[PDB]
Design a binder for this molecule. Structure first.
Ligand SMILES: OC[C@H]1O[C@H](O[C@H]2[C@@H](O)[C@H](O)[C@@H](CO)O[C@@H]2O)[C@@H](O)[C@@H](O)[C@@H]1O
Length: 275
């Protein structure tokens, strides 16, 4: 019939995946460790800022609803199933988020909660089109991630950094991501093949071209103009198609979502909204 929930086992990371039960005592941390989202034993779901409570989930939160919980046997739990839900029998309530209008049932599988470095909690419909480093965790919401927008050329020799990690279209023609310890976490394997150009194209395909526009390697992610290329500080490299569907601040259901930008017009992995 449907998806059932499993227990959450990612305490201290920045993301609560779909259909995972966060129980009392468990918490998320923003990638910069400044913010913590904590389900307390008293049934309050709380965000702390360097250890000081600055938000509590209740009826006062815009775009949320509180309804009766009749089931006495329902454990204290917080989980995401497109919308987020807090089951709190101690106060006879289910506190839940009023997300923006759903577009397909597949969103139920793709939508997870992110605790961002700016303290916002955001529900994000997230699809990893390509993951170059499946062994390295995806870490959304980090100010130190490097994001490349579609239409971004990787200039040969330029070192694009995300913390201590880097992505480089090298002199030898290889396209390589290096992790924080200096070792390569991923490479296209295009060294010594005559590579002249590496580009994250407007169609969302990452492509390394040789002489005569010959294709040497590509991510097979063409046809996704809203995708971004992300290099994380932990060495992860991936191409993701993502959109937020709720947040505790900034979000309005009728507003346009957009990523915040650096003073040099480069996007960062933090969602914001406007008209
Ligand atoms: O795998 C990343 C690595 O790829 C290429 O190096 C390969 C080979 O040519 C090297 O000699 C050996 C050891 O030095 O490692 C690889 O198998 C290079 O493009 C290199 O810069 C890159 O880090």
């Amino acid at each position: 019939a449907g998806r059932t929930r499993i227990p959450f086992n990612g305490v201290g990371t920045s993301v609560l995946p779909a259909y995972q039960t966060l129980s009392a005592g468990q918490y998320l941390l923003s990638p910069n460790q400044r913010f913590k989202l904590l389900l307390q034993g008293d049934g309050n779901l709380v965000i702390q800022d360097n250890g000081a409570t600055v938000w509590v989930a209740n009826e006062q939160q815009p775009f949320s609803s509180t309804i009766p919980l009749r089931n006495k046997k329902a454990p204290l739990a917080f989980y995401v199933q497109y919308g987020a839900f807090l089951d709190d029998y101690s106060r006879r309530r289910v506190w839940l988020t009023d997300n923006s209008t759903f577009t397909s049932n597949d969103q139920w599988n793709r939508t997870h909660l992110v605790l961002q470095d700016d303290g916002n909690i955001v529900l994000v419909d997230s699809l990893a089109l390509w993951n170059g480093t499946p062994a390295i965790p995806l870490v959304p919401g980090a100010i130190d991630s490097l994001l490349l927008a579609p239409g971004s050329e990787l200039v040969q020799g330029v070192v694009y950094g995300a913390g201590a990690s880097k992505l480089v279209f090298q002199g030898d023609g290889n396209l390589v991501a290096y992790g924080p310890n200096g070792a390569a976490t991923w490479n296209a394997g295009t060294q010594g093949k005559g590579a002249v150009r590496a580009v994250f194209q407007g169609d969302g395909n990452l492509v390394v071209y040789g002489a005569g526009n010959a294709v040497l390697w590509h991510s097979h992610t063409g046809g996704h103009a809203s995708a971004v290329l992300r290099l994380q500080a932990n060495g992860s490299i991936a191409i993701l198609d993502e959109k937020p569907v709720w947040a505790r601040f900034g979000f309005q259901p009728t507003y346009r979502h957009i990523r915040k930008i650096n003073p040099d017009q480069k996007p960062i992995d933090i969602w914001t909204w406007h008209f």
